[PDB]
Structure formats: C-alpha cells, structure tokens
Ligand binder design. Sequence first.
Ligand SMILES: OC[C@H]1O[C@@H](O[C@@H]2[C@@H](O)[C@H](O[C@@H]3[C@@H](O)[C@H](O)O[C@H](CO)[C@H]3O)O[C@H](CO)[C@H]2O)[C@H](O)[C@@H](O)[C@@H]1O
Ligand SMILES: OC[C@H]1O[C@@H](O)[C@H](O)[C@@H](O)[C@@H]1O
Length: 528
Amino acid sequence: SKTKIELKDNWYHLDGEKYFIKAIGYEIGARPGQAPYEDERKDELELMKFDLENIKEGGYNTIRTWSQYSENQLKLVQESGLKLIMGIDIKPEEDYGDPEFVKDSEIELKRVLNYAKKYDCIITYLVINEPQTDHIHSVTGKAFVDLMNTLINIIHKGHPGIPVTLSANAMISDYMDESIFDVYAYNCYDHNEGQTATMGFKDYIKGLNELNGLDKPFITTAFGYSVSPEGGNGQYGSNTLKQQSDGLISNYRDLIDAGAVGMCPFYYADGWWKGGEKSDHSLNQPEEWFGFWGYSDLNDKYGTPRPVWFAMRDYMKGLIISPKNKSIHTNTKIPLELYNDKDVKKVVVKFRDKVIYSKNITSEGYMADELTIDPVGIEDMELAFEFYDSDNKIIKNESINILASKTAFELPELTIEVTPEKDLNEGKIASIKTKIETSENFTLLDDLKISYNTHLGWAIGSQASVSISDQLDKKIITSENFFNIPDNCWVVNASAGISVRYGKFTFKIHDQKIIYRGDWAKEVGRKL
Ligand SMILES: OC[C@H]1O[C@@H](O[C@@H]2[C@@H](O)[C@H](O[C@@H]3[C@@H](O)[C@H](O)O[C@H](CO)[C@H]3O)O[C@H](CO)[C@H]2O)[C@H](O)[C@@H](O)[C@@H]1O
Ligand SMILES: OC[C@H]1O[C@@H](O)[C@H](O)[C@@H](O)[C@@H]1O
C-alpha cells in the first residue's frame, strides 16, 4: 500500500496530490569531533530522533542526505513522517570507467535498494554529488554518462517508481545534460559573481531550466550562506547571522521564481569536519558554518538554532509558486499557485491597499486559482500577499512584484555574440560583443557586467564592469570585451547582463553562451 509518485506538469505528485518538497539538507554523524566519511559507521539513532523532531518543528516535510542510510536509520525516518531524498556515496573523484569502481558501486547500490525499497518515505534518489568539470573531461563524458545510466537503471528496477537525479552545482555543471535523469536538479548559490552577477540568481537558474526544456520537475538540492567568523570571498563565508537569514529567504523566493517545485536549503547544522579538522571549529573555513544550527563547543552534541531557522519556519507556512516575483504579464488573468501548510485558513492579495483576491482555505497543500488585475499601460505592481490563521491573524506577508499590461509590449533586450562562437580550439583569445536595444521608460542601472567563466574547478574566471554612461541616450548600446582562453578550458559559460528599472520593478537583461573546446562533451553536454 505504498505511495504512488507521478511526475507531470513539472510537479511531483504523491497519491494524486501536487506536493511541494519542503526539504532541508541533513547530515547525521557530523557532530563536533565526528567525520561521517572517516569514522567507524554508527547509526546514531538517539541524535537522529532529536534532529528529526527538530526538523518537523522547523516546518520541513522532507530531509535530503548525501550518504545512504542503514535500514535502522531509514525505519526511523519512515516512522517520523518526513520524506527522504537519499544520496548515494558514489565518490566523485574516482574513475567512473574503472570496472572495479563500477562493480563496487553497483554491489553497494543493490545492497541499499534491497531493504530501502520497503520504505516509501523515499521520494528521490541522488546518484552522485558534485562531479567536477575537469575530472569528467579527464575520465571522459562517456564514462560518466555510462555510469549514471547503470545506476539509474539499477534504481528503476530495484526500487520502482522512485525518481532519480543528481547533486550538481549550477555554477560548474550548467553545461551538463540532465535529460537521462527523472528530475532536473542543481545546487544553487547566489554570490553575485560570474553567472549570478550577469543574469541574477533567478534568471540564471531559470535559464538552465529553459535549456533543460521545461519537461520535468526541477528541484534545488542545496542553497544558503555560511556565517564563518572570516575566510571565503565576497558572500562565500563571513556572513552575519542576519545576512544568513535574509539570504536564505531571498534564495527561496528566487528559486521558486526559477520553476523549482522542491527545495533543499543547505542545511541543518554545522559540520566541523568539513574544513579539515573535526575537533576544531576553524574561524576561517566557510564550510564549517553553513548550519541553521550551531554547536557551542566540542562537547555540545545538540546545538541551538540561529535566526535563519525561525525565518525559514515562518516563510514556509505559505508558499507562493505563481505569480512569480519579477514576472512579466500581458493578460488581465494571472495564474495563482499556492502551497499552504495546515495553519493557513485565508489568503488575501492586495494592490495599493485594495483587496483584489480573498479566499478561505479549507484544505492544506496545493491550490490553483486566478488573479484579476487591471494594469494601465505598462504598470509595475507590488502584489501584497497576506496569510491568516484560524483566528484571522496574519502569520505571513510576502510581496510579488510584477510588470503588467493588457497588451504585448517591448522590453529592452541584451544579446551577445561570442568568439570563438562554437569551438574554443579555433583561437587562444576570446571576445564578447554585447548589444543592448534600449527602450525609453526603462532605465539601465549601473554597470554592464561581463563573465567568461572558464570552469577551472571552482574559479569564476574573468569578469568586467563596463560603464555605459557615455552611451545612455543611444537606441543601440554596444561593448566589446576580450578574454584569454586557458588551454585547459574545456567549456565556458560566456554571459553579460545589466540591471533595468521600470517604476519600482528592477530586473536584469542578459544573454548566455555555453561553448565547448572540442567534441569532448558529445555525450555529457546538453543537447538542445
Ligand atoms: O556522499 C557524497 C559525497 O559527500 C561529500 O561530502 C559532502 C559535501 O560534498 C557536501 O558539500 C556541500 C555541497 O553539496 C553544497 O552544494 O554546498 C555546500 C556549501 O558549499 C557544500 O558543503 O556537504 C555534505 C554535507 O556535509 C557532505 O556530506 C564527500 O566529500 C564525498 O567523498 C562523498 O562522495
Ligand atoms: O572555494 C570553493 C567553494 O566555492 C563556492 O562558490 C562553492 O559554492 C563551494 O562549494 C566551493 O567549495
């Protein structure tokens, strides 16, 4: 009598009902003094009970993991009521083409499935975490793609009806074909650099979903901020607790706006192990301070929640999927899509302090309806949503900003032409020629940003800020920027973008090219 999972209209459905995955990343075996990949493996059931209870009280309906649970650990999750997105420990730096590696991975996965298939709390498998561009280049995309297929197929037979995808960072694996998987997924971070500086976070991830083809559900397997005392660069590491909390909420809205119907904020609690020494909480390792919970000292096995925990719990009470923030509408009818928890009994939408939508909610979960708006010409509109509880008291406010008209209209447009256009082998030097078709009434703000992300490990590559002050009054605004191509660049994401404003509506216009060195990515690269 197990949960039927159906993927359609780019949503997960459980037992016929659309189901927004409100997950959180969760790693057991990562208390101070512990390292989950090196220590003798323990079930840690007492600490899991504490954690699973905390996570239910934090508002989540799902956990997301990196490493397979034992049967004992799975049964506890099963009995908790939470859903599980279970990662499999398939070492990313290993040779995917090595028959011993393949066989060990297959034997291990089959061992897991043999009991895991009894536990219907599992709603997705993640078959690998974070394969690096250069490594794939080195062992070949075919080795990679063949391994993914092998494991996908073993899961489809061993635990039927459960979707399979992977954990892949959007900043380094933008180029990758994800069409072999059942759902599209990225780890998504907003550090306002490279792709996220040009396109902005919303538009970057949405672009990838469009390139993917808008034909499967899309989820995020990670996002968030580190509150390390120091270390990192820009917004990576070294955030305040307030920055962390405000950042998760900005991320949550943005990624919904990119089409996500499942969310795995990163993550439950700090892992001191992650910067190298598990017994020490290093002041300058961003990676050891990503938790929504932190530990006081080496002996603290429990920890306490940081402000982000409470902001997230509050934010998740009522989710707005449509309309989307920074969306453009040319109809008077706007799709409304909500995912309410059981405490939301009424939703109101206001424009300029006037009710345009009111509805008593009698059942939790997904609901669709339509908003009627009445824009004059091209009208920027802050849509003020209000969620109320059973006592008619507001428990959440959220704005959705739209740009609306009853009639089709012109936006300013940014396109790029990139050289080499199609094959990096054709020269040692690149160019990005940007062209902005302006539109009066739309103000271009600040600097044009250019990114030539050559994908060398985590490094962003060259960027450039170009002033367009001297050109603001022209219909067509141009720029040409040059970049040296590293010999070990196998793929590049070349992009450009600028901020635009219409009344109080601010957004970005941008364009993007993904360009490969040779035919190395015939198998692994996205086919359009
Ligand atoms: O089980 C698979 C794999 O796990 C690795 O350890 C993982 C980390 O890779 C992971 O890293 C996070 C990213 O997935 C996410 O996108 O961003 C955050 C912030 O930058 C990263 O920390 O974190 C989890 C949880 O601590 C770890 O379990 C192993 O290193 C690897 O050997 C193993 O195959
Ligand atoms: O410096 C390396 C780090 O850079 C960040 O942008 C990534 O999100 C991290 O996962 C990575 O380990």
